[PDB]
Amino acid sequence: SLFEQLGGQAAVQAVTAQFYANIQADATVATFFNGIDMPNQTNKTAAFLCAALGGPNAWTGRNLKEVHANMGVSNAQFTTVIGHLRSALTGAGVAAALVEQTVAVAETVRGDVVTV
Numbered sequence: 001s002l003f004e005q006l007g008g009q010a011a012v013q014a015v016t017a018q019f020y021a022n023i024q025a026d027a028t029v030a031t032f033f034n035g036i037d038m039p040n041q042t043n044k045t046a047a048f049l050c051a052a053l054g055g056p057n058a059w060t061g062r063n064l065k066e067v068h069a070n071m072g073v074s075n076a077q078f079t080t081v082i083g084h085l086r087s088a089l090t091g092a093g094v095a096a097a098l099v100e101q102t103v104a105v106a107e108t109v110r111g112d113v114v115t116v
């Protein structure tokens with residue numbers, strides 16, 4: 001599973017952590033996460049990706065389409081975050097092919113987060 005090729009639980013965690021960091025460091029999207037609990041965002045998202053990446057414990061949390069309704073996220077902006085995931089995976093040492101495969105799974109949620 002990509003989850004395994006990636007190195008497991010801790011690997012997805014570390015990558016997600018860097019993911020949000022790269023987000024808050026980007027002016028163009030950092031705004032949506034204003035006054036947002038970052039360690040929680042890191043944890044939930046991690047849980048979510050492990051599941052989507054083939055992990056053991058599947059996703060239980062809220063419906064993402066529902067979570068992000070009326071949030072003002074645009075495709076450009078979503079794309080930008082995806083790039084934050086890609087840079088995060090890259091600086092993490094992930095091999096190119098795996099990066100894109102992980103980013104590919106992340107992209108599936110584009111339809112549930114983008115609303116404008």
Ligand code: HEM
Binds near residue numbers: 033068073077078113
């Ligand atoms: C431009 C892209 C995105 C923006 C601006 C965004 C923004 C947010 C915000 C602001 C929240 C917090 C909700 C609140 O308490 O007010 C949230 C929660 C969440 N987002 Fe995103 N999000 C984006 C992309 C994603 C992606 C790509 C994923 C999947 C890796 C994702 C998964 C989640 C999850 C799991 C939660 C928490 C759901 C829960 O606790 O049940 N988000 N997002």
Ligand SMILES: [Xe]
Binds near residue numbers: 012049102
């Ligand atoms: Xe990840």
